[PDB]
């Protein structure tokens, strides 16, 4: 594929920095032709043959390709793609209403009806992707952005696909990526991956939505990963004293070591806790 | 343990930024009491209970503890430790002569006698650590700094211990850390770890010193890790056409999937290729 070999500065005005990914730098920008505001994602390119400062070209295309197919209200849109020697610049949809992580702390804990209002939107977005055999692999509060934060039940779009793959496979797909807190045991153990890893993440997100705490985080990175592979977590009455058995079951049907016994996305939408 | 709960700015002047680690920010600084120049490493602290922006407190102490014991000419020294709400600030020795990665590209390839001049110093530093049962876990050209770059056979000190552990164990130690290119298969497969992982890294460094290329890097992260677990590499005549069998053997006795059959640090110093 080929992106626009042009100066992004010619068509978009840069300013206010937003996210700060590993090799990704996000900046709030302004389209000159219309005045519309967009979000520009700078992806540094893997330099001279053998290096690690930057993302590989082949890995950048993968992300673009996925954003191209993608088309769903609860999911980000890619408008333009630029490129130069050093960086590829994805012009993306701007979601100004802040991350879900930010939103949580200020409420600190949601009611089950509120929690399911957020969850339904995720499950819709994740359902759409899984239909097209796309695994996000990085579902977490930081990649769940609200359109408007100051409305009663805020509406969300999913962001960041630098790690998403198409599981278009009678193949084998393994590797280690994502944030330790949210990764499924197969990623931790370096075992075959599928769409099932995202269902583990949602289980973790849901735990965080209800309790506020992360089910698997420990005092060290080592320990966080031990807990995940072991599946060492419990519904600590502290938070789950007044949580329904259905809500518990939903989470308990998603945090299952064996990816096959783990719930799928269509089963999650048919659950009594989520279903109307 | 307890660090200096004081403003680092009161005792050291900041300026020129050097490295840019994940949660670590390195800055070149100047001691006020003497005028001596030091390197200040800012470590962001893991914030409200459940988070990932920053290193855990327990993980920061571990690094400090290791730098405290540490005492060897080819190894960095920790002078002071400060702390505030957000960051812990390690005042470290300043190594101005740039990274080994930087040095390589401008040469771009070393002679075996030169290569062993660098290697001996590493093996000495790594030997000292392994004696005290300390595994660096992050041996790579970016963590190997030269004192003076413009001298014939430059002298090096090892840096960055945010990932180093003491393998003081009738215990189990597993987790995933380091740069994909240099990590040993047991880290990739999430299997028990020991001092042996560092011997894999040196094998990789040595390959890079002689050839310039990284033995296991592929076009994607997935592929890089496949090659490591598989141990898929060959002495490509392109680079190794004129490389000695001893140099080959040394590398070949270090890139062994099974950590036990892999060479130990004392065996590496007794090798004909390294030994006087």
Author numbering:
A (entry chain B), B (entry chain A): 2 to 277
Paper text:
DAPK1 and DAPK2 bind Ca2+/CaM through a closely related ARD, which is inhibited by phosphorylation of an identical ARD residue Ser308 in both kinases (Shani et al., 2001, Shohat et al., 2001). They also contain a basic loop (BL) in the kinase N lobe next to the kinase active site, which has been identified as a DAPK-family-specific signature motif (Tereshko et al., 2001). We found an identical type of dimer arrangement in all three kinases that involves the BL of the CD. In terms of functional implications, CD dimerization in hDAPK1, hDAPK2, and hDAPK3 is likely to inhibit catalytic activity by directly occluding the kinase active site.
Since hDAPK3 has no ARD, the hDAPK3 construct we used was limited to the CD. The second main dimer interface is formed from positively charged residues on the DAPK signature BL segment, which belongs to the most mobile areas in the DAPK structures. In DAPK3 there is an additional specific interaction with Glu182, which is the central residue of the PEF/Y motif and a key contributor to DAPK substrate recognition (Temmerman et al., 2014). For DAPK3, canonical kinase domain-mediated homodimeric assembly via activation loop swapping has been reported (Pike et al., 2008).
